[PDB]
Design a protein around this ligand. Structure first.
Ligand code: NA
Ligand code: NA
Ligand code: NA
Lengths: 368, 360
């Protein structure tokens, strides 16, 4: 009951259960179907602590549907599910039975999308989408401001649909080049003026802590299941199950490729697309086994439409290796013997499927 | 080789140390009202978020970066709501440049510290520089050098044992003062960072866990020590406040408070001493400021309305008392309170009295 849940919180039982669920999440790192090289293993436990931090903002600090606020569910030091390094992610908990206004300045970032989601990794292992809005339907006011309404009730203007079970808004700002693009500056509020928040309720905290702990276990399990499923096509980059990518919170404009890779120090993975389709954005990123992008603050581990130089015939080649071969487009393996990799077409009517092959890195340096 | 980490033992010990920290909330010398109790467990989770940034994510002295060690949703040791705090891990054997825009915020201080709560329960200071001595370039930019080797210009001292830089930007008026925009880098830059070292993560996770346990224990020890003078506001032991990472320009008062719904705490200073800044804030028992995003729980030199004789009155109460300066108890029956004189040659000691809210 609710009485027991509140009693367990006040007594410290919930805190014990919270920490023990965190502890049990270590088994997702120790799984025998995951690589056990020291780097991957060490990064896996850091990954768990990173999921923790995200989980607590998600389910404890920014979980009041009467008082929504944005936080970042993936960024430079906390990462989930092939986090797009070219994205500013913003997430707010909402209540699908209420109505919300998202306001602020549009900025100059060219790609901007708004998804409402329900469930959650901690609940159903999913982030099923309930509504969506991007530039195709967005109306920008003359003054450069943004006015967006989230509601289960149809509204005029920039309306993003919710269902009663909707519980999150996930914003993607996708940068061609963060140095020259300005992010949209968005705030979220409840439409009807809210009285000051009530004091922290033991029952609500009991639920937030357990959801946070279960988020760590389920999210790590979810994407570890994905990474292990890629082993049969290691070092290739086949198209992903698109409906599955959407069901875990993907953006419906995006066509995904996910795989795992494995390279010795003297090997390189050569990725080729013969043509580049008409699209709004594309990129490819290198990840560790836990599907965290590698550390793009310090390594070149993502190449996109803005930074990838095409070949003479219009194709694009991208090389995964320990050092750059000549002036080719390059993904730095950054000390990793193995990891995962993600390619995105955004807004492509006809995706073009990359081919891959493994060669000796010396063969590319001599030839280039 | 990091045997404990690679096997999962460190992760288990990390979680089990976190679990035992719940005893700092359940201590019988701490209040057991449900609000204080529930906030205590959220507080532990907030401490863990700070601890992981401090000891896991931003703990490489070769690749320093600022993060916030107290903000709107994670708070330590009577966090000043009028502060923008920034913290970076550094290595006292190396040299660092802090650059960026000075902005117009009048109070800006830089402290270098050693040890840490997770280690000795302390944050002893090793160097200090504030805005009064700083030299700003023509383009409004500022350059500050941290080093154990004496330097000309804007030099902040370090010792070999120095491991942290703590920046305070203290705002009189956030509407008219602009924050400094600062970044930190190591001067003798080397090759791109190495991949994660399992040994360093092994140490970082255990320090993060011990940070949660020692930090909550430390300030719960402080809060319980105030019980003999509940609802008074005596001067604190200043050297003790400095030893846990205080700013040496600051004279602190710490206490606990306890009020029924129909009671108010009336605080008075007969005069306001000449100073650069002063404020008073209302906290919960865990010495987190109350939620100033939605409640008026801090009054400072710029926003306090004075009395006619130049003195100031501040009232802690559940409902607004007339037009007096007000600290909102925000549903709390008990908590802690902190008063600051910053840069006052002669502190003036507030007096307190408990009255029925009807009298105001
Ligand atoms: Na992703
Ligand atoms: Na403080
Ligand atoms: Na602040």
């Amino acid at each position: 009951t609710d009485d027991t849940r509140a009693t367990q919180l006040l007594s410290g039982q919930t805190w014990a259960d919270f920490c023990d669920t965190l502890k049990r999440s270590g088994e997702q790192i120790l799984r025998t179907d995951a690589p056990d090289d020291p780097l991957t293993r060490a990064e896996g436990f850091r990954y768990l602590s990173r999921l923790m931090r995200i989980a607590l903002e998600m389910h404890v600090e920014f979980a009041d549907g009467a008082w929504p606020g944005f936080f970042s569910p993936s960024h430079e030091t906390a990462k989930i599910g092939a986090d797009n390094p070219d994205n500013l992610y913003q997430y707010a908990r909402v209540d699908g039975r209420c109505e919300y206004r998202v306001t602020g300045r549009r900025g100059t970032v060219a790609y901007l999308s708004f998804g409402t989601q329900k469930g959650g990794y901690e609940t159903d292992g999913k982030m099923l989408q309930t509504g969506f809005l991007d530039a195709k339907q967005l109306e920008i006011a003359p003054d450069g401001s943004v006015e967006i309404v989230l509601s289960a009730t149809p509204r005029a203007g920039n309306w993003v649909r919710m269902e009663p079970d909707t519980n999150a808004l996930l914003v993607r700002q996708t940068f061609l080049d963060r140095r020259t693009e300005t992010p949209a500056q968005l705030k979220i509020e409840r439409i009807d003026a809210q009285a000051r928040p009530a004091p922290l309720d033991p029952l609500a905290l009991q639920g937030g802590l357990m959801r946070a702990a279960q988020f760590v276990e389920q999210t790590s399990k979810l994407f570890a299941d994905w990474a292990a499923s890629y082993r049969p096509h290691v070092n290739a980059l086949p198209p992903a199950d698109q409906a599955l990518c959407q069901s875990v919170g993907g953006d419906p404009n995006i066509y995904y490729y996910h795989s795992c890779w494995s390279l010795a120090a003297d090997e390189a993975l050569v990725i080729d697309v013969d043509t580049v389709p008409d699209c709004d954005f594309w990129n490819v990123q290198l990840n560790n086994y836990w599907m965290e992008s590698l550390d793009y603050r310090h390594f070149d581990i993502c190449v996109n439409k803005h930074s990838a130089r095409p070949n003479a015939d219009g194709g694009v080649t991208v090389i995964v290796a320990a050092t750059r071969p000549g002036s080719a487009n390059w993904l730095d393996t950054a000390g990793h013997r193995t990891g995962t990799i993600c390619w995105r077409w955004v807004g492509a009517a006809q995706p073009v499927h990359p081919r891959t092959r493994v060669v000796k890195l010396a063969a590319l340096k001599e030839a280039a």
